[PDB]
CSV table of C-alpha atoms and ligand atoms in Angstrom, one decimal:
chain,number,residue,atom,x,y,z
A,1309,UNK,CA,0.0,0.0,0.0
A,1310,UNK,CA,2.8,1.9,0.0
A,1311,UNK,CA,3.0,3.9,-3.7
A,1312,UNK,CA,6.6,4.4,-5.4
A,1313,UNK,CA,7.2,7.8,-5.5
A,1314,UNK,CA,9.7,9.0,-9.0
A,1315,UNK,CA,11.1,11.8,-10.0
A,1316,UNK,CA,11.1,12.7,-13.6
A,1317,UNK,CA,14.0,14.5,-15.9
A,1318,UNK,CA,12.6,17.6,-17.1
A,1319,UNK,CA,13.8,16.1,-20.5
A,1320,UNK,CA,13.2,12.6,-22.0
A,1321,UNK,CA,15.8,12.1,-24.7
A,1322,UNK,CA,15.3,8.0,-25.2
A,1323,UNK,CA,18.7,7.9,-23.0
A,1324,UNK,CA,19.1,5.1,-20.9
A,1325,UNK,CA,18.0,6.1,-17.7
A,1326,UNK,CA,14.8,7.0,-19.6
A,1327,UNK,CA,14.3,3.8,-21.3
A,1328,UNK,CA,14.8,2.3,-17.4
A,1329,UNK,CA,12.3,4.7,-16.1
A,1330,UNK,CA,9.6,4.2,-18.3
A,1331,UNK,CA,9.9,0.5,-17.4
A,1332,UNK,CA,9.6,1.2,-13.8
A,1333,UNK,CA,6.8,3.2,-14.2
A,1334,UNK,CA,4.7,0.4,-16.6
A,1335,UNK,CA,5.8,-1.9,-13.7
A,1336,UNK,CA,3.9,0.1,-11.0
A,1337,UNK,CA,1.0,0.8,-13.0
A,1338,UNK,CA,1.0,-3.1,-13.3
A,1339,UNK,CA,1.7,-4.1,-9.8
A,1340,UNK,CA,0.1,-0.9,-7.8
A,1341,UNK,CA,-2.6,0.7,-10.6
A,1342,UNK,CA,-0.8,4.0,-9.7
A,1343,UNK,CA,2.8,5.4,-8.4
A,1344,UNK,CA,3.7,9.6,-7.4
A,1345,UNK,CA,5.8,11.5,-9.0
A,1346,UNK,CA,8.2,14.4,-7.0
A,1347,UNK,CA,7.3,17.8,-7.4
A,1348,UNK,CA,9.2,20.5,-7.1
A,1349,UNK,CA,8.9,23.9,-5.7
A,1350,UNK,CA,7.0,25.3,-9.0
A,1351,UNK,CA,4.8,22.2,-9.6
A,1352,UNK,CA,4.0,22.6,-5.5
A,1353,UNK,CA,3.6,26.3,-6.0
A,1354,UNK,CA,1.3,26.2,-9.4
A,1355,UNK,CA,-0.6,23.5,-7.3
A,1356,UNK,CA,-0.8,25.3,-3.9
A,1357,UNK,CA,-2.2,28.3,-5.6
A,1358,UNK,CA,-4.8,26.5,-7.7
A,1359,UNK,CA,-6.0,24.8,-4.3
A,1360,UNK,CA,-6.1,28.3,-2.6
A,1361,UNK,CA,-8.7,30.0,-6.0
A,1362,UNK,CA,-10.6,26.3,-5.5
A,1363,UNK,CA,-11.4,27.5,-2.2
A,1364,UNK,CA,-12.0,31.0,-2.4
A,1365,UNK,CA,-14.6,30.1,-5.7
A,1366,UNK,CA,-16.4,27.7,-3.4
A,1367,UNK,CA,-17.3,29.9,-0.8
A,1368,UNK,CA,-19.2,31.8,-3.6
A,1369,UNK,CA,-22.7,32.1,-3.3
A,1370,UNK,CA,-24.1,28.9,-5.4
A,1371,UNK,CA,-26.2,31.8,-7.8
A,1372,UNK,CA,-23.2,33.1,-8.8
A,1373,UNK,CA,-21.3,29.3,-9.2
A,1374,UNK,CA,-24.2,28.0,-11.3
A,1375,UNK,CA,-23.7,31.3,-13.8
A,1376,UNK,CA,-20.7,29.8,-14.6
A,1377,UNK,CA,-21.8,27.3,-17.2
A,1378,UNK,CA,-22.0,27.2,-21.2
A,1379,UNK,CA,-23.9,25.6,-23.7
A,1380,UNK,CA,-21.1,25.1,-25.8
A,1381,UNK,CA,-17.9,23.6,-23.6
A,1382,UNK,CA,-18.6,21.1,-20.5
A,1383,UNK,CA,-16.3,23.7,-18.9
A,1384,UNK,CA,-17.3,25.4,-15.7
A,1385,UNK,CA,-19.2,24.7,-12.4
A,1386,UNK,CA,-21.2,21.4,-11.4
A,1387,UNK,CA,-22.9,21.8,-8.3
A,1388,UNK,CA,-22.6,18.8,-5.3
A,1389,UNK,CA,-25.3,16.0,-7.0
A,1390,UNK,CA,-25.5,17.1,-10.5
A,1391,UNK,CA,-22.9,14.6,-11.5
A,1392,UNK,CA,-24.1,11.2,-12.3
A,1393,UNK,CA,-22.0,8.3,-12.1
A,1394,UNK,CA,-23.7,4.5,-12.6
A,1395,UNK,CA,-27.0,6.2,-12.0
A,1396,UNK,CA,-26.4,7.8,-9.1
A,1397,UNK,CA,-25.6,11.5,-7.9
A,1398,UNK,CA,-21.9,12.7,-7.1
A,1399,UNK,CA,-21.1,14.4,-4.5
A,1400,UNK,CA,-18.7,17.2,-5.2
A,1401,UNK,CA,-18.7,20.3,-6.6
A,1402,UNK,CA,-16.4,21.2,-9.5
A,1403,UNK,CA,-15.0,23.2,-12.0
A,1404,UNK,CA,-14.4,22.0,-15.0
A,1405,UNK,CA,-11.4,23.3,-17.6
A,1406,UNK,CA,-11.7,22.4,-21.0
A,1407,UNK,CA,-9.6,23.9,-23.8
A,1408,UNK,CA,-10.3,27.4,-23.9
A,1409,UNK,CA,-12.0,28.3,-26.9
A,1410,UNK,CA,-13.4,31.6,-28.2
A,1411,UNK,CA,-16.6,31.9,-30.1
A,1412,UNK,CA,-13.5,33.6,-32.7
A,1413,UNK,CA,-12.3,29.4,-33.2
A,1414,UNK,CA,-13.2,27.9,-36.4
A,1415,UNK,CA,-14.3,24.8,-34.5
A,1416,UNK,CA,-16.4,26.7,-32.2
A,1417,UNK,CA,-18.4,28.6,-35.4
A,1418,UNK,CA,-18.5,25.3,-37.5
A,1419,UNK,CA,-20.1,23.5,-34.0
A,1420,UNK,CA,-18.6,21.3,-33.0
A,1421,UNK,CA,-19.6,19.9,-29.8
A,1422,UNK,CA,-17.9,20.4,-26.8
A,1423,UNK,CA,-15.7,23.5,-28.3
A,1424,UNK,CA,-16.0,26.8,-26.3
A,1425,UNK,CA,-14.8,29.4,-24.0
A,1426,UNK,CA,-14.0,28.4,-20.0
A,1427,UNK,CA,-16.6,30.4,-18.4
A,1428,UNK,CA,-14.0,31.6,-15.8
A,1429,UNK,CA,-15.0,32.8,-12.5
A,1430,UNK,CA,-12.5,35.7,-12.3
A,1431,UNK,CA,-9.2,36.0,-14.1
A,1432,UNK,CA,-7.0,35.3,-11.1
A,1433,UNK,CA,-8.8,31.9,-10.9
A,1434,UNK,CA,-8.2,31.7,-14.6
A,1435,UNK,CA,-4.4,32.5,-14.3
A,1436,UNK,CA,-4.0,30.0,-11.4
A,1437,UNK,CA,-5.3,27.4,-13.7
A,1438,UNK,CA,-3.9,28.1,-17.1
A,1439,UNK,CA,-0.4,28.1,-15.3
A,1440,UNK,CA,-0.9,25.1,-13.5
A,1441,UNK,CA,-2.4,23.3,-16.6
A,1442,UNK,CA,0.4,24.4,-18.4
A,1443,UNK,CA,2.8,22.5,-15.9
A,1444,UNK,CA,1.0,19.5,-15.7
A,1445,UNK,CA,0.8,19.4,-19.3
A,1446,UNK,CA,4.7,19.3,-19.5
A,1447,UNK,CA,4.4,16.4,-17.1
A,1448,UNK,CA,2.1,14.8,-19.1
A,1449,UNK,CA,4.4,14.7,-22.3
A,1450,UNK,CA,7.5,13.3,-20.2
A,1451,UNK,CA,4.9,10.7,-18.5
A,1452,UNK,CA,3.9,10.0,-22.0
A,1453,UNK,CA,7.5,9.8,-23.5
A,1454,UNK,CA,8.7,7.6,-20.9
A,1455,UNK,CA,5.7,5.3,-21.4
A,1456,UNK,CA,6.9,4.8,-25.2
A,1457,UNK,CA,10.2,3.8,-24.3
A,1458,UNK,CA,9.1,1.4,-21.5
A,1459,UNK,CA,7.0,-0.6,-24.4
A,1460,UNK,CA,9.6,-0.2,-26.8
A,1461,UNK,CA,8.1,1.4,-29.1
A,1462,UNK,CA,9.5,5.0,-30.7
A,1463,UNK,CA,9.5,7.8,-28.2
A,1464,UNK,CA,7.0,9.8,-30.0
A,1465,UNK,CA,4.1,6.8,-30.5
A,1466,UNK,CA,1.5,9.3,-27.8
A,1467,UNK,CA,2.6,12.4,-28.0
A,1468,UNK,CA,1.9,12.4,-31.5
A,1469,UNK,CA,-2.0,11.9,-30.6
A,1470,UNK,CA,-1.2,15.3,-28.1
A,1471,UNK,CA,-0.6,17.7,-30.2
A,1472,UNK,CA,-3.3,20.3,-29.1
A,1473,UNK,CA,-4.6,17.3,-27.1
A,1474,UNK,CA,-7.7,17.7,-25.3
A,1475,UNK,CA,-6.6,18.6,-21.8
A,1476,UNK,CA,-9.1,19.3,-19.0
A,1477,UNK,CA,-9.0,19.4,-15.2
A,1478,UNK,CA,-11.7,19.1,-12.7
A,1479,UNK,CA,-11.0,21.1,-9.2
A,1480,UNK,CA,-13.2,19.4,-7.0
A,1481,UNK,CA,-14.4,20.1,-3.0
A,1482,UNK,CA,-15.7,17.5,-1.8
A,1483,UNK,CA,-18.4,18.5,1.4
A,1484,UNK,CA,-18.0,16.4,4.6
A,1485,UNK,CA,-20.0,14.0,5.2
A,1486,UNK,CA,-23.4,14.9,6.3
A,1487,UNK,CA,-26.0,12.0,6.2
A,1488,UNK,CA,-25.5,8.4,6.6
A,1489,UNK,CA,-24.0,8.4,2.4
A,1490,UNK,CA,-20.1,8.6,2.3
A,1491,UNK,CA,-20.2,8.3,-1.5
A,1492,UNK,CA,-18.1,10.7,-3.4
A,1493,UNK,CA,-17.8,10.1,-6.6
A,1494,UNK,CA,-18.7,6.3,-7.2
A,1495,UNK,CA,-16.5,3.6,-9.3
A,1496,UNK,CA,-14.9,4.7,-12.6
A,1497,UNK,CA,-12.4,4.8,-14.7
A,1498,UNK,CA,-11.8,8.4,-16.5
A,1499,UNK,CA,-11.3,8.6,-20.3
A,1500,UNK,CA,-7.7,9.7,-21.9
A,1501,UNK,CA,-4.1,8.4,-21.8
A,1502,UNK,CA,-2.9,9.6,-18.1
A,1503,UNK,CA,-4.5,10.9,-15.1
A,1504,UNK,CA,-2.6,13.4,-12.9
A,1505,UNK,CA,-3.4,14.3,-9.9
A,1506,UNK,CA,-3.1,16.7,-6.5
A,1507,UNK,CA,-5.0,16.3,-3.5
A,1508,UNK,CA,-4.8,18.0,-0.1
A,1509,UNK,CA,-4.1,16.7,3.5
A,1510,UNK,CA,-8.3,15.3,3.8
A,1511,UNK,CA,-8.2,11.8,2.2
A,1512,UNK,CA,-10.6,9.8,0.4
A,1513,UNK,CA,-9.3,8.5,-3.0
A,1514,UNK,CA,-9.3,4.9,-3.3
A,1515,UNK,CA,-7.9,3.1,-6.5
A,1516,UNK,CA,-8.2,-0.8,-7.3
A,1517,UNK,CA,-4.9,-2.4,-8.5
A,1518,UNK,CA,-4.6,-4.7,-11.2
A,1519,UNK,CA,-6.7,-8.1,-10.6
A,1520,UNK,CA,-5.3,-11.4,-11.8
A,1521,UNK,CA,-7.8,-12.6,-13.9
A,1522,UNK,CA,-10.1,-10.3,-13.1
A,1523,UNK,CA,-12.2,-9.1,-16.2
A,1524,UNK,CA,-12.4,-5.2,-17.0
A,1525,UNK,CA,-14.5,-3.5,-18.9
A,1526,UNK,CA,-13.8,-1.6,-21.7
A,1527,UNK,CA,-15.5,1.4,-21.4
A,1528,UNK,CA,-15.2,2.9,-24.3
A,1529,UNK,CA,-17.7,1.0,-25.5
A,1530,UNK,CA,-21.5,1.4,-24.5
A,1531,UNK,CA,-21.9,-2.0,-23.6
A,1532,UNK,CA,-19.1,-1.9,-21.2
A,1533,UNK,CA,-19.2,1.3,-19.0
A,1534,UNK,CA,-16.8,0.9,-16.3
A,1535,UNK,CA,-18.7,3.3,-13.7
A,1536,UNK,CA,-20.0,0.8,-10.7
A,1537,UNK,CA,-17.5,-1.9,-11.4
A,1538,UNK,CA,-16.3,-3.1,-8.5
A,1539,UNK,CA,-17.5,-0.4,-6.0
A,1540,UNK,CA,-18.6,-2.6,-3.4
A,1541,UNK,CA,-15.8,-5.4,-3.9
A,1542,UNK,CA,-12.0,-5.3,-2.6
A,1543,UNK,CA,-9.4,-4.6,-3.4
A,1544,UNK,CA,-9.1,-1.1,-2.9
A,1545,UNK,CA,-6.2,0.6,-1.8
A,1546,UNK,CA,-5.8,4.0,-0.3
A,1547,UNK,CA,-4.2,6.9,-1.5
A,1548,UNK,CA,-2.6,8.3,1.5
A,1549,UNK,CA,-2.1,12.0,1.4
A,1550,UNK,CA,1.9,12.8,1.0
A,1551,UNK,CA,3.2,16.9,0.5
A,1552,UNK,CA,5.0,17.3,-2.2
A,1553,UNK,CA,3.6,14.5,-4.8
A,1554,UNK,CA,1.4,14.1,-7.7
A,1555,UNK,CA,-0.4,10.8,-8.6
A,1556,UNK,CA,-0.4,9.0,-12.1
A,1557,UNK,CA,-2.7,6.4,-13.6
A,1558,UNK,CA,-4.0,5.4,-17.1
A,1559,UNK,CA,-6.9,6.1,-18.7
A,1560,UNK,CA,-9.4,4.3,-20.7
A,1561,UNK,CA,-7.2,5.6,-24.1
A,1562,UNK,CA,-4.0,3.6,-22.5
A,1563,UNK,CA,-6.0,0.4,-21.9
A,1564,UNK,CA,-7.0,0.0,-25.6
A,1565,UNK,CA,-3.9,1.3,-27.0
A,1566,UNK,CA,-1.7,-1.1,-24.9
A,1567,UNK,CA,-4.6,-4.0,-25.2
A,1568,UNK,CA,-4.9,-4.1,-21.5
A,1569,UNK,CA,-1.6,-4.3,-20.6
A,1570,UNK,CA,-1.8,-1.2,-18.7
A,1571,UNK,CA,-5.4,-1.6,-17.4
A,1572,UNK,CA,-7.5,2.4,-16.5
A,1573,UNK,CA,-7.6,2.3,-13.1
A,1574,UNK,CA,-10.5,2.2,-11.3
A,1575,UNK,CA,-11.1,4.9,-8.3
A,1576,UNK,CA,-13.6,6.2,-6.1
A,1577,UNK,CA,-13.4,8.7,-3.5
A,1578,UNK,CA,-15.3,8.4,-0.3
A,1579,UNK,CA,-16.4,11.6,1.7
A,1580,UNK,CA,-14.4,12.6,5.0
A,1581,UNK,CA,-15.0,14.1,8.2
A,1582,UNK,CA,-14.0,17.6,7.2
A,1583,UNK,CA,-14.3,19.0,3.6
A,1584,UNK,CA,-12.0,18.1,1.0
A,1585,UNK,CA,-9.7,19.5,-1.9
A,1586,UNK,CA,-8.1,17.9,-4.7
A,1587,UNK,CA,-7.5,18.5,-8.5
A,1588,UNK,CA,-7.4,15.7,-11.2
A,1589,UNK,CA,-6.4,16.5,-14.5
A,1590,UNK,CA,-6.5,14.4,-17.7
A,1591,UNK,CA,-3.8,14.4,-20.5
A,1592,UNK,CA,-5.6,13.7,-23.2
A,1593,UNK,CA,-5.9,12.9,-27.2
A,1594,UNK,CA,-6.8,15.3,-29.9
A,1595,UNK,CA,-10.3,15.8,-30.4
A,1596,UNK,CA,-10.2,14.2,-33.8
A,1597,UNK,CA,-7.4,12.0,-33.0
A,1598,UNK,CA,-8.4,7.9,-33.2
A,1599,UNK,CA,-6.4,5.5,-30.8
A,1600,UNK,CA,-5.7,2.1,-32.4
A,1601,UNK,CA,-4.1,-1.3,-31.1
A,1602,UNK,CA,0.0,-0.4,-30.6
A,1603,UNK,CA,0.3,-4.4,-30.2
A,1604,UNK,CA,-2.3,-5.5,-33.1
A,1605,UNK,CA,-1.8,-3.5,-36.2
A,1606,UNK,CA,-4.1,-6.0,-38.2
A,1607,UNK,CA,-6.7,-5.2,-35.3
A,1608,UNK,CA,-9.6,-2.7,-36.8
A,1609,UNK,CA,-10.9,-1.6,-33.2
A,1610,UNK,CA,-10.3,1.8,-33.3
A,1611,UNK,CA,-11.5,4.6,-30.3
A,1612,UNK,CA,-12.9,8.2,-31.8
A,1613,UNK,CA,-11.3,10.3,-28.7
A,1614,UNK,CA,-13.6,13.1,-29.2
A,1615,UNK,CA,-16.7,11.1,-29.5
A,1616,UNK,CA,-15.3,9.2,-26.1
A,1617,UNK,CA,-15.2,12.7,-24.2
A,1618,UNK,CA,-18.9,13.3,-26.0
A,1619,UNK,CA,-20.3,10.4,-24.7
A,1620,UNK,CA,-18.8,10.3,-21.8
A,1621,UNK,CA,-19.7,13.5,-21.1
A,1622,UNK,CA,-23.2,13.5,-21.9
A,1623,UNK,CA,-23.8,10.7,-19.4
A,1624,UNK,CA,-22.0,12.4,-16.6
A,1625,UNK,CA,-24.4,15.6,-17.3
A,1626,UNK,CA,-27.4,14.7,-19.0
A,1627,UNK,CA,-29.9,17.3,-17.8
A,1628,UNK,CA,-26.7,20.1,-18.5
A,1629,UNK,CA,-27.6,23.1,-20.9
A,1630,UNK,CA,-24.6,21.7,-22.9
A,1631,UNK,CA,-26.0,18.8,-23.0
A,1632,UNK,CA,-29.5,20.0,-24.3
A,1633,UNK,CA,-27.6,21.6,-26.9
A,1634,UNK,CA,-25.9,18.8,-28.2
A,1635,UNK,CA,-29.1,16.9,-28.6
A,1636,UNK,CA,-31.2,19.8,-30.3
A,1637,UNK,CA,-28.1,20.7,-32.8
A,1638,UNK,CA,-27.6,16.9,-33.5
A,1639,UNK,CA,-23.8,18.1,-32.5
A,1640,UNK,CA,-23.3,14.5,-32.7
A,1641,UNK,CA,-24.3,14.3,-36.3
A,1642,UNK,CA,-21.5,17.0,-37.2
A,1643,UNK,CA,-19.3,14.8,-34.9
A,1644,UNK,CA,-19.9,11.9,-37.8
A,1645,UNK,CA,-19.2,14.7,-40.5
A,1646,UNK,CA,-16.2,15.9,-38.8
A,1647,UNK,CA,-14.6,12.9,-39.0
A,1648,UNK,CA,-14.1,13.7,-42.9
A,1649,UNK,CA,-14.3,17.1,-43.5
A,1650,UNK,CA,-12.4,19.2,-40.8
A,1651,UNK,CA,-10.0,21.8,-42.1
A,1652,UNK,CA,-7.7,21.9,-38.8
A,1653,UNK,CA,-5.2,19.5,-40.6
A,1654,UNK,CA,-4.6,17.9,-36.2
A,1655,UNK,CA,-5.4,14.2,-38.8
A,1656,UNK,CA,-5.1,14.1,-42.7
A,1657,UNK,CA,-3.1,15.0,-45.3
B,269,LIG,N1,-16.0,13.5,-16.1
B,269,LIG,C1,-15.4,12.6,-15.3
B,269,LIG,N2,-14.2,12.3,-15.6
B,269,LIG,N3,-16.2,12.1,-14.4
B,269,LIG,C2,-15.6,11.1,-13.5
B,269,LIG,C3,-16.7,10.3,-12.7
B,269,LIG,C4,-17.4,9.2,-13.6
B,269,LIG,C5,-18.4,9.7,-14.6
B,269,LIG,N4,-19.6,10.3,-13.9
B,269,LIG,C6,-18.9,8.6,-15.5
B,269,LIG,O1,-20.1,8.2,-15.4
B,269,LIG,O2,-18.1,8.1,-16.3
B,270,OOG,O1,-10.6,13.3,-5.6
B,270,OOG,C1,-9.4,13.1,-6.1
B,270,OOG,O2,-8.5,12.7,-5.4
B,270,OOG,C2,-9.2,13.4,-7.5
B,270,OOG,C3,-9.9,12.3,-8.4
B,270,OOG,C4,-11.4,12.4,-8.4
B,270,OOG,C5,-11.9,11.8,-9.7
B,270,OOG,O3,-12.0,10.6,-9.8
B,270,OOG,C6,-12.2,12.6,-10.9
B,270,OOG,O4,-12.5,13.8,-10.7
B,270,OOG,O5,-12.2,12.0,-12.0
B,271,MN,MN1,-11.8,10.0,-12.2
């Protein structure tokens, strides 16, 4: 139960070291479901500070949280039980950051769903995020470099799916608990390649480790959502809070890229006695970028990883004024038509 904790080099060359490191970190994902990586005093800063605007935005009055919402992005606020996870209300309240897209982006004027402009609080909590997302990011791409090397394959094999990848973050608090329900956020796996993530000193994340023989679903697919799995069954280990760490652990992109070789851990977080901080953030595809079998390359499975955030998306929220829009636009319909006619040259000749 106790994680291993690595620090990265701010540069992956394919030395080496890095080749060694990136089978270390493969071999805690598959023994632990999760390791920590070192941060130092920037990354600790950039993360203190984004903590500190989390709680200063959530002692707003909920009027004024609820105004920050769009019909266009997912970004922005979701109040404690608007989230549904395996049919069943979450508990936190969040803010979501999506890429930050002006009504001025082609993609935003051509539709396409999910595409539009954070609806910031404040532009100090806008700053505090945009710099800390910008950190994490670089982490990201050395997580994801590393990651390459450990599965021999060429250094570059995820990072060339990045390249404006879809990055997001949700900065949760999480109330204490308050009736005789300590569910948080239920069972699930979340959607990318890599999940990074800072929490404070509360605790309540649990993750479930790699299961010999135990089946997992693939839930990319709509007959095999993840969220429930396992909720009620061990094991589940918890994520001690450490100063001066970030966790790591795949996402649903890395399970079906790698053919479950790296499995997308499972997690839940249960509510505490006092009320409870923490910031996960996803490193994700390009919108139009497909994931395919590294391991397989007769296989035709392939994942859409825009139309995985969609859907995804659209089942966490389904009452959400984004939402709504999606379905009275047929967004999804120019999500098919998107597939073949973009002009952002991210896929294509
Ligand atoms: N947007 C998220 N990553 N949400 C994480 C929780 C699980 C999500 N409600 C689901 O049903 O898949
Ligand atoms: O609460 C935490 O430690 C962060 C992870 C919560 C989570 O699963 C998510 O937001 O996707
Ligand atoms: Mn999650």
């Amino acid at each position: 139960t106790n994680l291993q904790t690595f620090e990265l080099p701010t540069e992956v060359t394919g030395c080496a070291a890095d080749i060694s490191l990136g089978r270390a970190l493969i071999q805690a994902w598959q023994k632990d479901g999760i390791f920590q990586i070192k941060t130092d005093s920037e990354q600790d800063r950039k993360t203190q500070e984004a903590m500190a605007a989390s709680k200063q935005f959530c002692k707003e009055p909920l009027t004024f949280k609820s105004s920050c919402v769009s019909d266009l992005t997912y970004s922005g606020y979701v109040a404690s039980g608007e989230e549904v996870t395996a049919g069943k209300p979450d508990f936190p309240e969040i803010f979501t950051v999506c890429k930050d897209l002006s009504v001025g982006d082609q993609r935003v004027k051509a539709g396409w769903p999910c595409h539009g402009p954070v609806p910031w609080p404040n532009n100090t909590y806008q700053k505090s995020m945009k710099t800390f997302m910008e950190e994490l990011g670089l982490a990201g791409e050395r997580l994801l470099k590393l990651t390459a090397l450990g599965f021999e394959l060429p250094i570059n094999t995820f990072t060339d799916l990045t390249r404006d990848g879809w990055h997001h973050m949700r900065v949760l608090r999480f109330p204490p608990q308050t009736s005789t329900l300590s569910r948080g956020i239920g069972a699930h796996t979340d959607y990318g390649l890599l999940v990074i993530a800072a929490q404070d000193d509360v605790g309540g994340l649990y993750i479930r480790p790699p299961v010999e023989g135990e089946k997992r679903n693939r839930n990319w697919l709509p007959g095999e959502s993840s969220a429930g799995m396992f909720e009620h069954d061990e094991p589940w280990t918890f994520v001690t809070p450490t100063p001066g760490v970030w966790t790591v652990f795949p996402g649903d992109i890395l399970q079906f890229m790698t053919g479950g070789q790296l499995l997308s851990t499972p997690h839940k977080v249960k509510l505490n006695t006092r009320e409870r901080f923490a910031c996960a953030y996803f490193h994700e595809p390009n919108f139009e970028a497909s994931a395919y079998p590294l391991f397989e390359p007769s296989a035709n499975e392939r994942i859409h990883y825009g139309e995985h955030f969609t859907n995804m998306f659209m089942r966490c929220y389904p009452d959400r004024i984004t939402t709504q829009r999606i379905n009275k636009e047929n967004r999804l319909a120019h999500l098919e038509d998107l597939k073949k006619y973009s002009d952002t040259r991210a896929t294509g000749s």
